[PDB]
Amino acid sequence: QNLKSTDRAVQQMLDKAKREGIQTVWDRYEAMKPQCGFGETGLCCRHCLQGPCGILPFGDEPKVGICGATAEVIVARGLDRSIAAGAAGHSGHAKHLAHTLKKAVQGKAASYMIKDRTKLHSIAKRLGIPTEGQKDEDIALEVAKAALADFHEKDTPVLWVTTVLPPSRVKVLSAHGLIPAGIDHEIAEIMHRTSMGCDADAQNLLLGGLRCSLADLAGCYMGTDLADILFGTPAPVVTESNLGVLKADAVNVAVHGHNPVLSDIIVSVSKEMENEARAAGATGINVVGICCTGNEVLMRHGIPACTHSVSQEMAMITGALDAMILDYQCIQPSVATIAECTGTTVITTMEMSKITGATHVNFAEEAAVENAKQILRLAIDTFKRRKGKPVEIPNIKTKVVAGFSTEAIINALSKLNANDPLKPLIDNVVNGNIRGVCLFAGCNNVKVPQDQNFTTIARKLLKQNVLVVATGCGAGALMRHGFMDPANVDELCGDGLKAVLTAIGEANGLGGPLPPVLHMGSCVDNSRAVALVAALANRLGVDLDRLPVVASAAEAMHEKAVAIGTWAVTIGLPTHIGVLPPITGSLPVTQILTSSVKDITGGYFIVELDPETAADKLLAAINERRAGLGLPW
Amino acid sequence: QNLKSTDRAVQQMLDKAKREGIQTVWDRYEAMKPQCGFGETGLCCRHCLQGPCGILPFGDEPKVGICGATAEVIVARGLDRSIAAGAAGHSGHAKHLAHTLKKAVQGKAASYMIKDRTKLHSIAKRLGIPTEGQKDEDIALEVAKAALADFHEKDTPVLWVTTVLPPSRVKVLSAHGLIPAGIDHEIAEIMHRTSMGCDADAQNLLLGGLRCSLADLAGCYMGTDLADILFGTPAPVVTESNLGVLKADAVNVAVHGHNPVLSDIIVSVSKEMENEARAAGATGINVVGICCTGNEVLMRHGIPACTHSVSQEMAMITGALDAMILDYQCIQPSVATIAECTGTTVITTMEMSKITGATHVNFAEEAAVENAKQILRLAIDTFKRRKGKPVEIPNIKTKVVAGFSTEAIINALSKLNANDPLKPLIDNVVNGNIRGVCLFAGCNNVKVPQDQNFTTIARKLLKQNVLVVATGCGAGALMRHGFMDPANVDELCGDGLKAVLTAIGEANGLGGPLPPVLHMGSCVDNSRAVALVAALANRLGVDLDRLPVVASAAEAMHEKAVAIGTWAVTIGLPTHIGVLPPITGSLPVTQILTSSVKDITGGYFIVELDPETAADKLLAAINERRAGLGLPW
Ligand SMILES: c1ccc(C[n+]2ccc(-c3cc[n+](Cc4ccccc4)cc3)cc2)cc1
Ligand SMILES: c1ccc(C[n+]2ccc(-c3cc[n+](Cc4ccccc4)cc3)cc2)cc1
Ligand code: SF4
Ligand code: SF4
Ligand code: FES
Ligand code: FES
């Protein structure tokens, strides 16, 4: 059980599932072995009915595809389509948010409103939309128009790429023709060039891949900015993590997915229907949370985080989980089957994301509350069946400090310098108390013992005075193991990082150091770490590829993670991935992604499956960047 | 050699290649066997780094994906991504044409102009763009704006879907939410919903797939309409087919790809540089043609068709092929390698479609002639090396009649009824001389003896009074075996079809029957067959699913072909495919594509790998539709 997940609560619920014969993800993974060499190394293509074409990594034929596609071209095309799929996911998420804002300022969905007025004004000014002398609805609709424009071609390029990167970085990207023209446009062109008979050069293909990763970066920032406008900009919050957030006597409602347009409304509406949950017998309605929509309502409402990706099923095995509200993404459809055994009621709410056997509730912004009131009642009814029955909640949970948006981070820093909030951070970078910055992002993965890479590399980095932030399932892994609890800054952080954190946190009326890891939100909110990093570059007058900033998708699983790592490389960062990417089948392609791309964007990939060696390689990247700045290390 | 291609010239050049050790596609296909059951049956997914997940078609585990994706969901997601890739190809083609028209009417590329004024006016009126009182450049720019709008969301849906189908058909499609909102939008949403953790219901997924096939249909029509505007609407032409179009003493220049924006300019410019080709020793410049751009210049300029998809390499083995101008699509990259042995100079001209080892010429509309003049010279220089050397051109070619655009077809029909050109065709449908209509479309495929399915099914249909049209590589297969020669109407056609063809052709001043097969252009120009079919439906006041019209992608290979077959199903047609699609791994998905979709669109798939049984099944579909209309059969 240790072999599967370092999460002790997950280890308990795995024993429950094995005892009851309810099949988990690890069981399916065991059933899948041995896995295919062609597929796991990228040497397989099916863009043709001319057959599935595999190339043996070594030995005699098959050496090449039937049409003449070499190993490098096949690998690059597959990787390109991975990036395109991730960009499509983030694009659709931000597109839905854009239509929500547009339908909100046009009287069409009264449940949605401009919560953060300063954020809207600042985004408009960055976009060049004039604010002074404009009604908030007109300027919000102008922002909403501008957001939708960025999906197609126009006069200006994708402004969520070109207005968010430092001008030097934008210029470097332009010099190679890497600035996107349209998010959906880049997606469609990638799907064009990777089809049979199209582009058949690895260098050209990978250049297009970088260009599409920037479309994904635009999608993430668009989603971040729009969610900030609609639902509020995160400010520091304190809540709990792991399955212990569940309580047997409440209606346990899990928000699962990625788009807050649904779950924020659920969170607000449920508190007033606790007026009705009492009569059903429960204390009230308990909105636990799963995955990045769970972290969206965590970062903006203090909602406890129940669990995350590879162990999402483990929320249900407790048997006290009544509802499961799904929008989309990183949802194992297995839950819909597992529900029949656990008594959970699975609900899907998107027209374009349905699971066979799962209840569908056609959700509209126009009826945002209505739907919600209905859905809660379902869970409430599902609690009535649970009356006076046995459940097994692992009495295990940790303390998490979150809501560290770039706004919140800079405000916390401004207590140390009012006129120059970035200067304290850069001062402590110079004097060695903060060595570098590392962003843990990305998924979990059934191939990696859950939360192993994140926690090990985080331990190593924190001992060595690295300021670590985290998003998505990386943030979930770090928070379920206590990395967001200042009470552990003592065990975890080095002396210099400890001094900086303890200065900032106690300066901000918190009364204690900032937590060992700065939870910066969901997967789309990786854009936040762009902003912050971008800001620092602007302050130093250098590009992102000169800063001691690295990223580590330590346990990546989803196509989104591949796209995110690619655009982390593109904007200039050393970017580690702790899962094998499907590139090993072509030495040239791996060489480009690890060595040659340094000469194009300044970033490069670090593919290390050993977290110890990965942490040393990240340390050496940070120390390289320190050396380039003529600083001690 | 018979086992590979029924094309006798191809059989000769295969012997040459084997004698010289130059590896062909069939050799690579032999090296690839045995092929993967998982991949060829759709039971493999790699949308995750959680491993390549395969499901055994029968037996024990692996039964399901690691995330819980059943066989049906995996199969549907793969098929959806195939359709998305095909729609991306056609979308990019039409998008490039749209920018060419926009850059032409805005003074930015003087080499391009509004060749067909009536076509532009008619398209504007259909779109609702007013013509009267507008300059041709302003209305052309309005059409160009409208074309680009259809890639993203707006107020109106994709107008190249909704303004081209009969209102009853559009209503049927709307009733199921199948009308696209944006070509690139549908592409991106498909790439979203097929990612991990997203949509996991086979019915829902296939509904989305139909909706995206309509985006592909819009892309094809957009390309057709734009190419008609830019370069002329096809009128009947006579030329030759197969490798015998090549001549040892000329500069043999092959246009290969799909976008005429390049090759039409090459065709026009080359005739004036024959003034320079004489001095190089050659007679002149011989613009043979390959694939659908070859058929574009065939249908609009009488350019001989050299060869097509699976045997494209066979153009080079002659050793007298000097140049190879590539834009994109269904180009085996192997040519770039094979050139080193054959002395051909391979040229790529698109920024987003490059082959390693192939000369790249960065082509712009702005420099359309300049590039062209350069490129020809290359070929001319490549002819100088060929001076006084041996070559092996199979002394084999056939006679092809083409240029039967829907405009040309209706004009030919109007000689029999001036006020009602469709009535003669429908009269002869009623009285049994024309039983049904069959559109042969789609690729060749190395798994099928080249041109076998097309020719066999065409023979059977023509004996039985079916009016057969053809596009793309289906048209190429039929023309290389003489199906476009009226001299064979005697051997091929039944008595009633013979009477109708002989009436129309001799009525049109041709002096002989129309050819046994009506070549209707390239793959995008399958939209033409939509128009014609749509018109007939409008004339009869019934939907497309009531007409004796079927389609047969008899030897499909490219993702485009899958998308085309899917939207042929969607608009109501019985649609055969003669290659195994990756659907067999899920009986529910195959059932939907073959049986249940009849209840949603009226069309259905016919998957038969035996051309005899396929022809009987097509005959029975046509006779079913005749029976539904209360007619003899
Ligand atoms: C030590 C040992 C094992 C690990 C975990 N691990 C890492 C990599 C692979 C693997 C397997 C097959 N390949 C094909 C291949 C290789 C070269 C060229 C082309 C293709 C690549 C890599 C398997 C397991 C980490 C550290
Ligand atoms: C007769 C004989 C042979 C042919 C040519 N042909 C047609 C089909 C297949 C084939 C192979 C494997 N399957 C897997 C499968 C089957 C059922 C359910 C799930 C999966 C499906 C089909 C192989 C060869 C045509 C006519
Ligand atoms: S398109 Fe080419 S590389 Fe891809 S599967 Fe078909 S033959 Fe192989
Ligand atoms: S995303 Fe799911 S179905 Fe697809 S390969 Fe990964 S585990 Fe298998
Ligand atoms: S051969 Fe296994 S992934 Fe295709
Ligand atoms: S297992 Fe062969 S196609 Fe994936």
Residues in contact with ligand 3 by the CB-under-6-Å rule are A 45-48, 50, 53, 65-67, 69, 74, 196
State residue A622 phi and psi, 5-degree precision: -60, -40
State residue B350 phi and psi, 5-degree precision: -100, 140
DSSP structure class, residue B48: B
**R_g of chain B computed on alpha carbons:** 24
Q: Are residues A434 and A485 in the same domain?
A: yes
| Reported structure resolution in angstroms | 3.1
Residue from the list B197, B328, B559 with its beta carbon closest to the beta carbon of A329: B197
Q: Are residues B587 and B483 in the same domain?
A: yes
Residue from the list B31, B194, B581 with its beta carbon closest to the beta carbon of A49: B581
Q: Is residue A390 part of a domain?
A: no
The CATH number of the domain holding residue B182 is 1.20.1270.30
Instruction: Report helix, strand or coil for B388.
Output: coil
Give every strand in the sheet of A345-348, ordered side by side.
Answer: A285-290, A251-256, A323-326, A345-348, A359-360
Q: Which domain holds residue B25?
A: 8-54
Four-point Cα dihedral B269, B273, B274, B276, nearest 10: -170
- CA–CA separation, B563 and B575 (whole Å): 12
Instruction: Report helix, strand or coil for A309.
Output: helix
Among A41, A44, A50, A314, the residue to mutate for chain B (most B Cβ within 10 A): A50
CB pairs under 8 A between A and B: 324
Q: Are residues B564 and B418 in the same domain?
A: yes
Pairing of strands A345-348, A359-360: parallel
Tokens standing for residue A539: 């302050």
Q: Are residues A443 and A344 in the same domain?
A: no
For residue A34, give how far its alpha carbon lies from the nearest alpha carbon of chain B (Å).
10
Tell whether the torsion through CA atoms of A513, A519, A525 and A530 is positive or negative: positive
Boundary-marking domain end, from A231, A264, A293: A231
Boundary-marking domain end, from A180, A196, A231: A231
Q: Are residues A328 and A362 in the same domain?
A: yes
Question: Which string of b and e fits B433-445 if b means at least 16 CB within 10 Å?
Answer: bbbbbbbbbbbbb
Q: Are residues B222 and B267 in the same domain?
A: no
**Whether residue B177 has its Cβ less than 6 Å from ligand 5:** no
Instruction: Identify how the structure was determined.
Output: X-ray
- CA–CA separation, A137 and A143 (whole Å): 10
Give the helix/strand (H/E) hosting A566.
Answer: helix A559-570
Q: Are residues A203 and A272 in the same domain?
A: no
Contact status, residue B323 vs residue B344, Cβ threshold 8 Å: yes
Q: Is residue A139 part of a domain?
A: yes
Contact status, residue B513 vs residue B506, Cβ threshold 8 Å: yes
For chain B, how many helices (H) and strands (E)?
Answer: 25, 15
Q: Is residue B137 part of a domain?
A: yes
How big, in percent rounded to 5, are the helix, strand and coil portions of chain B? 50, 10, 40
- CA–CA separation, B254 and B267 (whole Å): 10
Q: Is residue B65 part of a domain?
A: no
- CA–CA separation, A514 and A509 (whole Å): 11
Look at residues A346, A363, A364, A345 and name the one whose alpha carbon lies nearest to residue A355.
Answer: A346
The CATH number of the domain holding residue B361 is 3.40.50.2030
Q: Are residues B370 and B415 in the same domain?
A: no
- CA–CA separation, A632 and B566 (whole Å): 63
Q: Is residue B62 part of a domain?
A: no
Q: Are residues A290 and A357 in the same domain?
A: yes
Q: Are residues A330 and A474 in the same domain?
A: no
Instruction: Report helix, strand or coil for A583.
Output: coil
* Number of domains making up chain B: 4
DSSP structure class, residue B3: T
Q: Is residue B3 part of a domain?
A: no
| Chain A residues with CB-CB distance to B176 below 8 A | none
Q: Are residues A18 and A84 in the same domain?
A: no
Boundary-marking domain end, from A385, A408, A441: A385
Q: Is residue A238 part of a domain?
A: no
Burial class (CB in 10 A: 0-12, 13-18, 19+), B410: middle
How big, in percent rounded to 5, are the helix, strand and coil portions of chain A? 50, 10, 40
Q: Are residues A493 and A624 in the same domain?
A: yes
Residue of A nearest to B209 (CA): A352
Q: Is residue A391 part of a domain?
A: no
- CA–CA separation, B294 and B316 (whole Å): 16
* Stretch 198-217 of chain A: residues touching chain B, C-beta under 8 Å: 198-204, 208
Give the helix/strand (H/E) hosting A241.
Answer: strand A237-241
